[PDB]
Symmetry: C3
Subunit: 451 residues, 3 copies
Amino acid sequence: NITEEFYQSTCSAVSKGYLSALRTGWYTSVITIELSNIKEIKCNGTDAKVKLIKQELDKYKNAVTELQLLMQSTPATNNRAFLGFWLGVGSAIASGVAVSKVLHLEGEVNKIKSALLSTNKAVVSLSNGVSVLTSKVLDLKNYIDKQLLPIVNKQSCSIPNIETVIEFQQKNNRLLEITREFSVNAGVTTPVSTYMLTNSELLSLINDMPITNDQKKLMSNNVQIVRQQSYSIMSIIKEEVLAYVVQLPLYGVIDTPCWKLHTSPLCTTNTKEGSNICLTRTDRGWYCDNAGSVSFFPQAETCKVQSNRVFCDTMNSLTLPSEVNLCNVDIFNPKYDCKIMTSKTDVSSSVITSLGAIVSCYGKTKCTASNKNRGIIKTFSNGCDYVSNKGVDTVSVGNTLYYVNKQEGKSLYVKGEPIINFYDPLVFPSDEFDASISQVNEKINQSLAFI
Amino acid sequence: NITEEFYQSTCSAVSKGYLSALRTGWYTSVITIELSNIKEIKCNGTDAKVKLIKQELDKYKNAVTELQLLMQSTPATNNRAFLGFWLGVGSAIASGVAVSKVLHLEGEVNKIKSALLSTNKAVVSLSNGVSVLTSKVLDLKNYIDKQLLPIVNKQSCSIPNIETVIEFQQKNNRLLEITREFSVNAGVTTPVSTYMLTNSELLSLINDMPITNDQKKLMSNNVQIVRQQSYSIMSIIKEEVLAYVVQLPLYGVIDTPCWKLHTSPLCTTNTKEGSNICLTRTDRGWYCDNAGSVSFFPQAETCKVQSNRVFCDTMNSLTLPSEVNLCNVDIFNPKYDCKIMTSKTDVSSSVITSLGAIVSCYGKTKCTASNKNRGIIKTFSNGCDYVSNKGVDTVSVGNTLYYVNKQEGKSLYVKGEPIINFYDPLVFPSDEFDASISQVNEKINQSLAFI
Amino acid sequence: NITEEFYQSTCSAVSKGYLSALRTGWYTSVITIELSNIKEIKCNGTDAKVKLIKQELDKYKNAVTELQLLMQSTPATNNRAFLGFWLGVGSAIASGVAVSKVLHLEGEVNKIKSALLSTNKAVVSLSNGVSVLTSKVLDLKNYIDKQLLPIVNKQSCSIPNIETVIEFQQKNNRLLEITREFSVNAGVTTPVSTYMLTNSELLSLINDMPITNDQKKLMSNNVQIVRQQSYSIMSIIKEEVLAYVVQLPLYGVIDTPCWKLHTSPLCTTNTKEGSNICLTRTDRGWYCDNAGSVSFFPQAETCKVQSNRVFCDTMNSLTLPSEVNLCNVDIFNPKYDCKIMTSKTDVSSSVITSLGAIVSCYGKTKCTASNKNRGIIKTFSNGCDYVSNKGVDTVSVGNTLYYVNKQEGKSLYVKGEPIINFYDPLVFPSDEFDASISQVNEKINQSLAFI
């Protein structure tokens, strides 16, 4: 059950009661498609049903030709060199590309083809060492050699029935689409499409993964999230086997507390126009308890939320001491230096929270919260304020209409004096772009000594 | 007719003569697909035409199974917690998700199925209250029960003709694609694809909307823009009816003046290398008059422009006093504090405007404007300059070639002394990341008192 | 062969040994599809094979109707008005849109239709002047007039065979998909899909381009990259011809040296918590020698890397003096003012380089580098450090696991004192958001004079 608290002193709000699901590692799985080496199509026929099989066979041959141009290139994701700019930089698919390099080595391909001879699903120990679960999803070699073979290799082609022309177009379409996606994605796609892996196959891949029963239940009830956080890496096409690597999210952190810290600018409301100072907490984002520290996601838009569960990637996190949470109840606590910025602003805005809305209303801006049946129900005055989503349908700031989340949950309004009122405007360090409480303090004592 | 003005004093340019089209509200509409509860397919047949119907029936059943995994999850868009970082934060699909929650309630589904029994287009008052326009686009229940029913439910299957196998694949493809998109988008897509709503159906949905005749004409002549600003929200699949919510843009603001303010860095050009100071207007973006204020879009790349009309979302806007426009003619006006930043830069760049190009040329950079038939026609000197797009095809700065817009329109070069020349470099507040004219002034008077 | 160097003094690393491929200009090519003006389909027939041809003919007519709504609108890409925010602003498709405006003029269409009457590939001089290579990829007019004509125009329709219903659906699908993409992209797509241009046609378009043999070899071995950097611009549909403009990357810069500069924060490691100062190089990104200057891409994620070649767009570059490279060996050199920022940070992070990983480890964060078979092999201490990818599989910082690139190459650890140790914390300009070595120096001398 979700709850929420607003801190009038620091113009922020925390939504509590969420559960974690943090991508920590990667499970690399091999997907294979058995092909037939169709060098040529010896058939003169002008028969309409043969003409359509030759057309679908050219697309197949062209798809193979297209895919060979891709396996000859090293696939790669290109990465860099409020607080998101402090984030580390990691190669997102370095594990999958390492496995893709193993599939290029001679004989390694033959190991895969042989393991999937009797079953379409088997575990394989690779030459380098990593144990991967291989799965054959399409046996076009078998189909062509059993249905389309008598029509090729003979100049006098035995004309096929209409249902084979249609069924071949059906089976071949998957290969053409897998090729279509790799052709515009430089051999690396994400999310993984239902052509790379159908919902049927994905679930079957999950239930056979070396993971706990908790994780199997979790990934299956959130397959749409698994796809968005997965990659499909084109690998090899040789010796009648097309292989592409699928990289699936591992959730090493599950069911730990998560909260979302919302922040908005806190300014003075003096009638004198330029005499106002401002202060804004920059530690907003998702927080989840994680191994005695707190995983901090400074760009909450990167996480994905399903009901009350939060799906994030630790690649988008900073690892903070748990004391960072003291900034919500006491931004002046002596145990963690709470981050703020102090660029002046005279613009109004609202932040829609999980169960309410923060309103930073300044200047001459109209700021209200309304109900569809009753119109305006609260009028915000200058400063930073909050309203609960109970009985409220919309919030308007200026010419911007916000809808509030109608999620069920109790909100708590923690009254407090705006901390912006404690500072003398004559010695306030404005335009600190990425500072903190202590940094402002020690800059104030330096400007006071100079005076 | 488009015009433009360049202010040599503040290194900026304003393109005038545009018309607004601002997304203010949302029109939620229900799209439905009548299905048949096909529990099983009792048929032993090895006939090729029956084998292909069983194959297409499995895809249908799997699509339903896939969609049920999605209706069991709460759909959500994940949002945050030059001046874009001052923007509010709103749930983009909170209205559609509220309607999606109403469709989950018992009996509410039966209301929809009954209203669309005789017509495929009807208005429905929901239990909560909002009046929504429901539209049935596919009756697969009717098709299967009228063409595919005699082949199932009988162990001795009456074999169907080839044209029914093909036509069933045709009709069923739309359902498989709608499912395909929701499966990789966590049940929320945007833009709305032609599978969610065909151009035929969208226009028919627009002409029946409760909106003015002006808005009907507007949305129809810009359907490609309507799609990009729309969402499709998976809702429910129960009682033989699949329902997904489509959220369409409401344009409460139309035909008001719009102008695009372009800005580029203004620096001194002293021969002494480190003695130079810089100044850059940070109020660039789209501006549109809106209800006595001015809607300001600080990230112009979010708006979409079609001929001389500007399509923006008020969710991406700040609401400023109209006096903000005084910064173009007089950046020192006493009625609005014009925003600037003062980080030093020695790099050159160009901004391609609607009818010309601004050039910030500094250091040893080659800056020219050429014509395809005649080569270089103007050579920029150090400082901030401008050239009109008449007779000019390209602008080069350093190793970067810019093409200019060949749009027709008159440009006006407003000569003026660069305001960067009015400041003493010895007491200039460099590296003000988000300041303003007054903030620089009062920081200069503080550094002068200390001296 | 790739190499790399880490500078312990400035907490940065440079990967050397790459080759350039810089998009400088645009090659505009015209793609055409010959259509038939099918006003109406005079046929009463209830025959199943005729019903399916009427269905596929409606989709064709609707696709034309949809495309006419798009040619009536001016296509446009919407653009703006660490160091990426200093980048110029250019219209990405201004050249293609200029050609699209030429196709709208009367008689210009007839010139194209006539040039492609005998061949499906010919060069055309346009009325304005630019020489463009036109290519007809689909002749649906010929197909309908030769196979589907006897079934229309007659009330007593000669019923067609089943293979023509299927083949018409096959040929028509490309048109429906081209229309599908333009309908959700406001008539401008990128990357160019295989429906806009198949891998077969693209290569054929490349080999016939007016470019050097080096460039033909380059673009063909990297077709997946060409597509991602290409645009497809809907143009005209009139006089039985649909024309859309394809804009292809021109690589004026090839085979010049490229290096990727990685940077991470450099801080003091005093036991006193708030007494620490920090410094971070902001010149990270891709660098490539380019015409005696250096093209600098401050957002390395925009470039695309294939093996050891770097594909970038000069539109995403700044043109710097080559002396900028002196910041790697001597950040204090007197010939270029090296850019830094000095916002304090106490968070740890790692940057995965081409051949190793930088680790900025501060506070109480666990920072290690492990091997899959042997576990932790190095433990980082507070400060900024580096480890080579030889023998190392992963790096962990806090709760974040990074995989290292297993690329082959030698790394060089250039020992040096952290330059952050040279500054007195009592007069250090913290929170300089975009400064440089000289700017910090001259601000230190001003704070010292005040003291």
